Structures are given as C-alpha cells and as structure tokens.
Amino acid sequence: GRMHAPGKGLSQSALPYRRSVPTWLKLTSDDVKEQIYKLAKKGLTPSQIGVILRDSHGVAQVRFVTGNKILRILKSKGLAPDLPEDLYHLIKKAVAVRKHLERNRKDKDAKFRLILIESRIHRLARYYKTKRVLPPNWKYESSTASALVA
C-alpha cells in the first residue's frame, strides 16, 4: 500500500534470476564506469544514469557488470551530489507546491498535498540522519527550502 495514498499498486521491476553478465555485452567494467563519470559530469542523477545506460548502452544491471552500484561508484570518485536524489526531488517538489500555493490561496487540495509531501520529507530525513548521510543538525525549513534545493 502507498504511504500517503489509498492505492495498492504492484507496478515494479522484476530483476531476472540470471545473475550472470550477458555474453553479448562487450562493454567492460571500466567502459561502464567512465560512462558513469561522463554522464554525472553532464548533470544526470543516478536514477537518470541507470535508465540511460540500460536503454542506450544495453546494460542489464550496473551492479552485475561492475560489481558495484551506481551511487557507490559515484561517491568513490567523489562527484556524487551531497543530497540524496530522492530527498532532493521531494524538496524540489515541495518548493513547486509552496510557490503555487502562495499564488492560489484557496487551493485547499494543494495545501493538503503540501503536508503529505513534507511528511515524506521529514521521515526520509530522519532515516538519513540515522545513517549519517545528513548532519545531525540538518533541518528542512520552509523558508530555507527554496535556497537549499536548486
């Protein structure tokens, strides 16, 4: 079930049982890793990297071909973004909702959605504080939201 919606969607991605690298994939581990460096320097999030590599370079799983995940590869070089991507997009959405909400006062639906989005922000932030991704004094403030994101 959805965290903040009454839906029970099963739309997922079924990873194949085959853990072996495909034999028709002639790209090697360094070939994929330099591609990760090139696209990250272009400005693509790790979610955007995996979809592009799979679609265009025909790689099954980056973990399968390189032995490590995309985010682990990005941080080992050190060019990975300081904010986690999902937390970044949640805050970025909250800024768009807040900007639209101040323009339209009577959008009670949007004000309802803002609480839902911000609740996901504060719950995800608590998880990252446990894993020390964020500083212990980090905080999502509505006033500073438009600055920290984008």
Binding site: Y17, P22, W24, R54, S56, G58
Partner: protein, 83 residues
C-alpha cells in the same frame, strides 16, 4: 482442481501469469538489436525504452517512448538476444 501441480507448470500459463506472481520472477522485457535503414551498425535498444535512443553517429531516431513498449520507427529491423 484439488490436484493442481504447483511444482511443474507448463510455460504457457507462466507466460500468461504476472511477472511477480510467477513461480520464479522472470522479466517481460529484453534487449533487441535494432537495425535502422541507411546505416551499417547495430544499436542495442531496451525493448521497453523510456528514452529516444540515438546512435553515436546516426542522426536518426530509432525508438520513441510510449506506455509499455518502445515504439520503433518504421523500417527498422530488430533481433532478439538469447531470448
């Protein structure tokens, strides 16, 4: 059907079944060797591609993103890879 054979189902119904609900999770997608006309190289394309794929050199759009399956442009061949 009290005597349904849950261990050994013939693959016709397994292909009919949802990917998650199969006996073993098998994806419903693949990678296809797409061969656009007017060129000489084979470009690997995910069968459910969400992006407009392009070659390193070809200035020709190979597929377009739709709901479930990548929509190949007309005239381009495609070959399966190891099923």
């Amino acid at each position: 059907p009290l005597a349904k054979d849950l261990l050994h189902p013939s693959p016709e119904e397994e292909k009919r079944k949802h990917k998650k609900k199969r006996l073993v999770q098998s994806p419903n997608s693949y990678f296809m060797d797409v061969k656009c006309p007017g060129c000489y190289k084979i470009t690997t394309v995910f069968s459910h591609a969400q992006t407009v794929v392009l070659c390193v050199g070809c200035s020709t759009v190979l597929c377009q993103p739709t709901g479930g399956k990548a929509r190949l442009t007309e005239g381009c061949s495609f070959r399966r890879k190891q099923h």
